[PDB]
Design a protein around this ligand. Sequence first.
Ligand code: NA
Ligand code: NA
Length: 260
Amino acid sequence: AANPYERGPDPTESSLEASSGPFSVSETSVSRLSASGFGGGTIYYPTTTSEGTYGAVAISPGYTATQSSIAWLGPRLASHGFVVITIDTNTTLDQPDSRARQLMAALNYLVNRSSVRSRIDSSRLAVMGHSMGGGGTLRAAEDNPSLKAAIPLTPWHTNKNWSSVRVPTLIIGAENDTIAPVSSHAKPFYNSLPSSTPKAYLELNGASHFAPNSSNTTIGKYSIAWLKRFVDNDTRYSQFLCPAPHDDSAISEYRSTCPY
Ligand code: NA
Ligand code: NA
């Protein structure tokens, strides 16, 4: 009752690892011609409106890719209480800085022109992307500090310095990525992020560059947790992002000199 942005019941690990959240998901689409500043998209959104409006998320594909490579994120995130647009880019060969402009154009369409705008709270927006759309997710985050959250997935970018980003960022890289190797992309990106901005780095064990293109329980769970925590201020989701022993109902307080 205190936080006016909480949606859905108390999270558990099970509900975040499941293939669907608690909300039924409808979808619509904007054509490429209609879409001003990006190559069209599909919009996934919670069918129900009775609990209040929702935050919105734009998601961008990578180099030479279309929405079908990020398609599974749409229903996965939308079912936890989010309006999601998986876009195509103006061309499949757009460099990451282009994709950042298109990520913002997409959120612009969603807020102002789309048929589900009344369902969005336009002050609570987030960006996500894969590969060069992850680099575009970083650039868009630096240039629009009013974003609530950003999630680069196996990101790629020639720029390695992201110290001006004041938006909470969760970087998901892949341990065996041979296309955007974490040692020269995802890990440098995270180290350069400031310590005053909440941030996180999650490396997928054994994963390749194409882990984000298929349904993935880990990417799913931690993205939902990250967006809920920062697009909704939902502190019910801190137990997954900052796990502690006092999360157990039997333990009121725990402190340690961890890590040991
Ligand atoms: Na267009
Ligand atoms: Na407790």
